Design an enzyme around this catalytic site. Structure first.
Site, PDB file in Angstrom:
ATOM      1  N   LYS A  85      -8.264 -22.863  29.164  1.00 34.87           N
ATOM      2  CA  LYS A  85      -8.469 -24.166  29.780  1.00 34.87           C
ATOM      3  C   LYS A  85      -7.988 -24.129  31.232  1.00 34.87           C
ATOM      4  O   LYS A  85      -8.677 -24.598  32.136  1.00 34.87           O
ATOM      5  CB  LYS A  85      -7.690 -25.237  29.006  1.00 34.87           C
ATOM      6  N   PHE A  86      -6.802 -23.566  31.444  1.00 34.07           N
ATOM      7  CA  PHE A  86      -6.234 -23.482  32.781  1.00 34.07           C
ATOM      8  C   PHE A  86      -7.077 -22.579  33.682  1.00 34.07           C
ATOM      9  O   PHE A  86      -7.106 -22.752  34.901  1.00 34.07           O
ATOM     10  CB  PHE A  86      -4.790 -22.970  32.710  1.00 34.07           C
ATOM     11  N   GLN A  87      -7.768 -21.617  33.079  1.00 31.74           N
ATOM     12  CA  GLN A  87      -8.613 -20.723  33.858  1.00 31.74           C
ATOM     13  C   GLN A  87      -9.807 -21.509  34.396  1.00 31.74           C
ATOM     14  O   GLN A  87     -10.240 -21.289  35.524  1.00 31.74           O
ATOM     15  CB  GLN A  87      -9.096 -19.551  33.000  1.00 31.74           C
ATOM     16  N   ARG A  88     -10.327 -22.431  33.587  1.00 32.60           N
ATOM     17  CA  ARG A  88     -11.464 -23.256  33.994  1.00 32.60           C
ATOM     18  C   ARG A  88     -11.033 -24.156  35.157  1.00 32.60           C
ATOM     19  O   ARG A  88     -11.768 -24.326  36.129  1.00 32.60           O
ATOM     20  CB  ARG A  88     -11.940 -24.146  32.838  1.00 32.60           C
ATOM     21  N   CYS A 111       1.127 -37.629  48.926  1.00 38.13           N
ATOM     22  CA  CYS A 111       0.041 -36.889  49.560  1.00 38.13           C
ATOM     23  C   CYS A 111      -0.626 -37.612  50.738  1.00 38.13           C
ATOM     24  O   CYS A 111      -1.421 -37.011  51.462  1.00 38.13           O
ATOM     25  CB  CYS A 111      -1.024 -36.519  48.515  1.00 38.13           C
ATOM     26  N   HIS A 170      -7.908 -35.895  53.507  1.00 39.30           N
ATOM     27  CA  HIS A 170      -6.968 -35.179  52.647  1.00 39.30           C
ATOM     28  C   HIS A 170      -7.777 -34.506  51.543  1.00 39.30           C
ATOM     29  O   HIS A 170      -8.607 -35.133  50.893  1.00 39.30           O
ATOM     30  CB  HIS A 170      -5.884 -36.077  52.039  1.00 39.30           C
ATOM     31  N   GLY A 203      -7.258 -33.788  48.380  1.00 36.02           N
ATOM     32  CA  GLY A 203      -6.514 -34.009  47.151  1.00 36.02           C
ATOM     33  C   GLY A 203      -7.084 -33.202  45.995  1.00 36.02           C
ATOM     34  O   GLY A 203      -6.345 -32.643  45.181  1.00 36.02           O
ATOM     35  N   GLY A 204      -8.409 -33.145  45.934  1.00 32.41           N
ATOM     36  CA  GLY A 204      -9.092 -32.406  44.889  1.00 32.41           C
ATOM     37  C   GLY A 204     -10.552 -32.286  45.273  1.00 32.41           C
ATOM     38  O   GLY A 204     -11.056 -33.105  46.045  1.00 32.41           O
ATOM     39  N   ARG A 205     -11.238 -31.272  44.752  1.00 31.82           N
ATOM     40  CA  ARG A 205     -12.644 -31.094  45.078  1.00 31.82           C
ATOM     41  C   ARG A 205     -13.453 -32.311  44.619  1.00 31.82           C
ATOM     42  O   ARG A 205     -14.342 -32.774  45.331  1.00 31.82           O
ATOM     43  CB  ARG A 205     -13.200 -29.826  44.422  1.00 31.82           C
ATOM     44  N   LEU A 222      -1.674 -37.240  37.431  1.00 33.82           N
ATOM     45  CA  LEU A 222      -2.891 -37.450  38.211  1.00 33.82           C
ATOM     46  C   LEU A 222      -3.992 -37.925  37.281  1.00 33.82           C
ATOM     47  O   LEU A 222      -4.517 -37.147  36.494  1.00 33.82           O
ATOM     48  CB  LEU A 222      -3.360 -36.151  38.882  1.00 33.82           C
ATOM     49  N   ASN A 231      -3.657 -27.404  48.179  1.00 32.40           N
ATOM     50  CA  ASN A 231      -3.151 -28.737  48.503  1.00 32.40           C
ATOM     51  C   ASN A 231      -1.698 -28.688  48.977  1.00 32.40           C
ATOM     52  O   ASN A 231      -0.763 -28.669  48.166  1.00 32.40           O
ATOM     53  CB  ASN A 231      -3.256 -29.649  47.280  1.00 32.40           C
TER      54      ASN A 231
END
Lengths: 388, 388
Positions: free
Chosen positions: B54-57, B163, B302, B304-306, B266, B335
């Site tokens: 999951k973390f790899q995704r 942020c 910013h 923050g995320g894609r 988040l 980030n």
């Protein structure tokens, strides 16, 4: 289309002015003449017979008669880790701080807002100063919610500032108000001892002294340039603000945020430090105004400790009374950190009015306000009093 | 003798201007395409086979290719409590922060100062922004010492901002520079993941995502009004700064300082939140300038995320390229919180110069800079580019 034109109409014209002051504190009053006994009892340190006698001496020469404290004997019982000298308790302390700091801060803001008499929506800036209570969003956010401030209020969250922050918020407020037409700044300095309270140690004397000085309290101040005639009531004008770092003073005052709460130290030399460097700050702030007689202006000094007040007064050669208002607050509230100078400011104008003096600054035109803190920082704010 | 006259000569005349930018990061570069494996290994979570996949995704769709990090495999080994999901480690993390934040911040300041070309002594204000590293005196103090700033520099220590602080420091710097003649502000935003790094939990997914986005880095900016012809080189002018609180968004982004370090969350809806409220901020900041086409100005957002970048771009209908500089920084640094927008600002003017464009803002006259953070705060700064 013109950044130069925008700037020209966007800015205020006059000096930043204190328009209202409001204060509040936790109900609980702790008597100083019996604190040594109360302290050693709830901390379970009765076996430290000598240290207790020592702590009793400290509380006596403290010149503090009363202190407001959120922490009660009951709240202490439910928190053993906080009664110990050093035990994991950061989480519990921060939660108390996060909850109480915004709370008492709101009570103070409401009083200031009422005095000011203008609508909430007119507050354009929010400066919230507190020693701790770390969350994201922060305590400033909670204040906005509790108070009902506009969602577009520009915020300035000042965490872990130090005992000199009273000057810091004024230095910051000056620029916010003066640079923006119609800007009305709300300063909220809320301090709470939940993070610094802890048990006694035969090895940490500095920490023991702080247990005798710190107290709880909040102060709210409205600041703006170009007061509205008859509608707004100017109390003091911020003339100039200086900040100074005294060389080789890091070990003077300070502390670290740890798992056991906020630790701290206070060197026995701070009074000497402050006194030996106090005149340079006065000169830097009054020579330009052609003021040489420091007794010809009113005072508002951080009440860091009685020794400090005595030393400064002795060094600068100040009539007794110059420090009366300051000592009055120290005696009824103790050391509320950043909130102290505003309680003194409030007291001074209150007393000046009832005595029928000609100005808010004890009938004098000019005055100075000092902040003393970590790294041994000195905030020197020059203040012009307002009439009647 | 005249507070009105003092004010008149004490103030600056033009708009606050970015005069130089400097950046720095911990040497250690961590490859994103192999972080899931590195992360689950040093955390001893190999048994969480599913979570690892999951973390790899997460790391793949992160659109981050590299991240600078003070924390090495070695530093992690010497700190087991930090590799665990939740274990007492605040003291160790704060010490790393206290030591590294000022350090990397100085490296960035030195580069900015060199570019600026003016003497140290000319820096009148210091704004230090960092997520954590609580001490008294604070990190700002250390910066002064390490850098050699004047002991009378006015300080503004911004702890735990969020942020969105990149906009905060610009909003504050605007007033400091514009309100004081000759004032030269040094902004130092230094972020370090030491406080937020921790092991994985099958129950805390938000915390797992942050382990994929945050990185280390520092940015230094010199800001002042009325640049000296030929001696100083204006890059961008701060036209206006707005701060906005989006209602019902507290659970969007946030965190608490605990004994186990800085925790955080988040919500998967932040991209929607930011997108649904982004146009009001644009309107509030461009309607007065008569700008309706958001593709006719340059951007600095910013990262923050894609997902955030994709959503905003989709909602505002922005050419791809508008977000190119921003995505470039996200891809090479990740980030870095408050430090990101200045790396993007730096990159934009660097690229603009080498491509021979007519202005620092990709050849366009106006541009916008956004900050996104806790309580779901939106900082909207309008920026005028400078020629050649």
């Amino acid at each position: 289309v013109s950044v130069s034109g925008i700037r020209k109409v966007q800015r205020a014209e006059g000096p930043a002015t204190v328009l209202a002051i409001g204060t509040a504190n936790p109900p609980n009053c702790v008597d100083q003449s019996t604190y040594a006994d109360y302290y050693f009892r709830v901390t379970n340190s009765e076996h430290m017979t000598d240290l207790k006698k020592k702590f009793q001496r400290i509380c006596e020469r403290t010149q503090i008669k009363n202190r407001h404290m959120y922490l009660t004997e009951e709240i202490l019982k439910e928190n053993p880790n906080m009664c110990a000298y050093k035990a994991p308790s950061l989480d519990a302390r921060e939660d108390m701080m996060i909850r109480e700091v915004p709370r008492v801060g709101k009570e103070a803001a409401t009083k200031a807002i009422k005095e000011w008499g203008q609508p909430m929506s007119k507050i354009t800036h929010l400066i919230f100063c507190t020693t701790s209570g770390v969350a994201l969003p922060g305590v400033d956010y909670e204040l906005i919610v509790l108070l009902g401030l506009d969602p577009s209020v520009k915020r300035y969250m000042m965490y872990h500032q130090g005992c000199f922050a009273g000057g810091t918020v004024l230095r910051l407020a000056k620029d916010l108000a003066e640079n923006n037409k119609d800007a009305r700044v709300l300063i909220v300095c809320s301090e709470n001892t939940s993070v610094t309270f802890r048990g006694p140690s035969e090895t940490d004397m500095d920490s023991l002294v702080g247990q005798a000085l710190f107290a709880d309290g909040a102060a709210a101040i409205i600041i703006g340039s170009d007061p509205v005639p008859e509608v707004e009531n100017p109390l003091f004008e911020i003339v100039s603000t200086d900040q100074q770092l005294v060389p080789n003073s890091h070990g003077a005052i300070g502390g670290l945020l740890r798992e056991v709460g906020l630790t701290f130290y206070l060197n026995k030399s701070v009074p000497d430090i402050i006194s030996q460097n106090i005149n340079d700050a006065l000169s830097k702030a009054f020579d330009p105004l052609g003021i040489s007689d420091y007794n010809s202006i009113f005072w508002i000094a951080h009440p860091g400790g009685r020794a400090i007040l005595d030393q400064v007064e002795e060094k600068v050669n100040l009539k007794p009374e110059k420090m009366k208002a300051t000592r009055d607050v120290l005696s009824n509230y103790g050391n509320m950190s950043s909130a102290c100078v505003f309680f003194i400011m409030d007291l001074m104008r209150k007393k000046s009015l009832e005595a029928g003096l000609k100005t808010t600054g004890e009938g004098l035109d000019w005055g100075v306000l000092f902040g003393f803190g970590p790294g041994l920082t000195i905030e020197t704010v020059v203040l012009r009093s307002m009439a009647i």
